Amino acid sequence: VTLVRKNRWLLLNVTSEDLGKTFSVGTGNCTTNILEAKYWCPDSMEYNCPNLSPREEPDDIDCWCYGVENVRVAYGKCDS
Amino acid sequence: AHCIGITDRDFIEGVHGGTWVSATLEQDKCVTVMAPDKPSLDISLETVAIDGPAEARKVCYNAVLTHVKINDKCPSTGEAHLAEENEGDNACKRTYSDRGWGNGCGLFGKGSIVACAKFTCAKSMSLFEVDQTKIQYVIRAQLHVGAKQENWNTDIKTLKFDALSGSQEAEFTGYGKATLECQVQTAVDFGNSYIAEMEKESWIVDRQWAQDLTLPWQSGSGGVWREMHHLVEFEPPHAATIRVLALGNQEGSLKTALTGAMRVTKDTNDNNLYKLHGGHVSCRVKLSALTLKGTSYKMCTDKMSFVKNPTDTGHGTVVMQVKVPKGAPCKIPVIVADDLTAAINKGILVTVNPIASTNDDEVLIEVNPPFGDSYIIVGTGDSRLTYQWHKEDDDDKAGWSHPQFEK
Ligand SMILES: *[C@@H]1O[C@H](CO[C@H]2O[C@@H](C)[C@@H](O)[C@@H](O)[C@@H]2O)[C@@H](O[C@@H]2O[C@H](CO)[C@@H](O[C@@H]3O[C@H](CO[C@H]4O[C@H](CO)[C@@H](O)[C@H](O)[C@@H]4O)[C@@H](O)[C@H](O[C@H]4O[C@H](CO)[C@@H](O)[C@H](O)[C@@H]4O)[C@@H]3O)[C@H](O)[C@H]2NC(C)=O)[C@H](O)[C@H]1NC(C)=O
Numbered sequence A: 001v002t003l004v005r006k007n008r009w010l011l012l013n014v015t016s017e018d019l020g021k022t023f024s025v026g027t028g029n030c031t032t033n034i035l036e037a038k039y040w041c042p043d044s045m046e047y048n049c050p051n052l053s054p055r056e057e058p059d060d061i062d063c064w065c066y067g068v069e070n071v072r073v074a075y076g077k078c079d080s
Numbered sequence B: 001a002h003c004i005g006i007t008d009r010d011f012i013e014g015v016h017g018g019t020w021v022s023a024t025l026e027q028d029k030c031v032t033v034m035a036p037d038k039p040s041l042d043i044s045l046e047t048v049a050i051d052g053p054a055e056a057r058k059v060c061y062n063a064v065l066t067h068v069k070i071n072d073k074c075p076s077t078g079e080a081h082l083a084e085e086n087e088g089d090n091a092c093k094r095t096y097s098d099r100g101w102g103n104g105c106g107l108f109g110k111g112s113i114v115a116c117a118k119f120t121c122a123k124s125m126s127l128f129e130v131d132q133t134k135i136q137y138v139i140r141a142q143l144h145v146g147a148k149q150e151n152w153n154t155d156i157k158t159l160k161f162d163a164l165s166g167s168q169e170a171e172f173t174g175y176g177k178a179t180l181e182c183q184v185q186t187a188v189d190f191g192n193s194y195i196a197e198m199e200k201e202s203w204i205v206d207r208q209w210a211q212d213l214t215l216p217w218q219s220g221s222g223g224v225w226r227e228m229h230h231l232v233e234f235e236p237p238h239a240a241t242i243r244v245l246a247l248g249n250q251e252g253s254l255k256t257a258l259t260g261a262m263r264v265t266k267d268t269n270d271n272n273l274y275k276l277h278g279g280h281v282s283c284r285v286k287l288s289a290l291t292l293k294g295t296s297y298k299m300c301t302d303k304m305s306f307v308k309n310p311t312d313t314g315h316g317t318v319v320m321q322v323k324v325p326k327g328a329p330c331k332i333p334v335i336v337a338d339d340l341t342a343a344i345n346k347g348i349l350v351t352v353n354p355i356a357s358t359n360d361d362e363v364l365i366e367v368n369p370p371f372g373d374s375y376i377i378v379g380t381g382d383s384r385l386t387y388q389w390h391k392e393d394d395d396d397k398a399g400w401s402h403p404q405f406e407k
């Protein structure tokens, strides 16, 4: 995984190697469970990762963060 | 002379005193025009095509989606936006997703969500405007002079036409000239038709049908794709994501729909030339300027011989190749009589006034013998050539119409 600061947003750039992994981001954490994700290519996807409350269980999302604001996940579906 | 090489043939007969005749030229057919004291004229429709038709539209049937962006906002916090929405090369969709506790929203309800994707057209179908006036058609013309088959292609004058091209002259050295006023008649109305192109394949399609296609289309000269959403699939949204997928290649569907359409042959050499099928050309031919060479020539009196024996053409006519070793320049005397005694010509001479300008010339002569038993007689005296012939009375491939007089 690579995490980059782009303007107001913080970009979670993940691969198939990051499947289900949780990462410590600053004072909070972030998690992605995206089977679709493989390696980067123009056939990509980028969207928001909801900032959840301490006891907020994920609902209808495959990417989320606890205590981290303005994070978007991005991934590719191509093989290296 | 080339009509002999062509299976479907028709004979136009001119009435003595007339100057014009009317002929209908279909593709893959030939027409032999005969007038008294005039050399017979083979005319045939080679190709009917359109050259450089302006491209009206392009219709993408295979699209490729790249770089999908999705933005969202919790209920009652405003609409969600993307910069790609302003980008013309992007197909976008605005909708709403169920939000609340579980996806980081303090309110339960419909939250804004938008998806954008970079649209690239992998494969598109071209649609050309067919101009009635820019329609071109080519006609081969040739005379019956006595040329060997091996020479036909060099004696054939090629007449190029378009709509309102004016009359075209066909000038034959030593035999004058014939004039053709042609009008092209197409099978298809082009006021409501496009020329559709997919890969190497081409068709004639209806304009209204093509415009009504639920597919992304691009204007002439291009640069903008309209109605991209026809090849883009947005699945029902989740809280913060939407699965956006490019639709399947619509090549198959398009071809399927195109099975019920007339087809067009794209020219092999030129990428802009489109040859039409089934069209015909109505021609008016002036013959009064045609003349016969060797009218002053004395008749051949020397011993001639058959290079090629009289043979059926499949048109109910007979061709022979006669060698003239001595006597040239001279007229070759040819009749088709009832017997060896009579001297009345019952046959019809396609090669009007056959001549041998030089010695050892081999003159190809075509003649239409009468039905039943007859004798083909070339030359006179004891050295003359005779060949017994019989015409079956069975149906031949050649068509004969009523002789015509036009002032
Ligand atoms: C990513 O971050 C998630 C969010 O964690 C938040 O919480 C704080 C503590 C920090 O971790 C911040 O990063 C963040 O804002 C993690 O999910 C959460 O993890 C925490 C820690 O394990 C869970 O908290 C625990 O909840 C237990 C609930 O059981 C009891 O709860 C009620 C009261 O609510 C009790 O009355 C009942 O008896 C229930 O049995 C609770 O038992 C725990 O308390 C004990 O532990 C804490 C700290 O260890 C200690 O201070 C306390 O005195 C006790 O000893 C604790 O409160 C939380 O439930 C959980 N939430 C969800 C939605 O999963 C996530 O694990 C993390 N990911 C990784 C990989 O680390």
Ligand SMILES: *[C@@H]1O[C@H](CO)[C@@H](O[C@@H]2O[C@H](CO)[C@@H](O)[C@H](O)[C@H]2NC(C)=O)[C@H](O)[C@H]1NC(C)=O
Binding pocket: A002, A011, A013, A040, A074
């Ligand atoms: C996510 O990470 C990939 C992998 O690094 C990024 O792709 C890189 O882009 C650079 C140009 O900026 C190129 O050298 C290659 O395409 C990639 N480099 C390497 C080393 O793999 C991709 O741009 C990232 N996604 C986003 C949205 O930033």
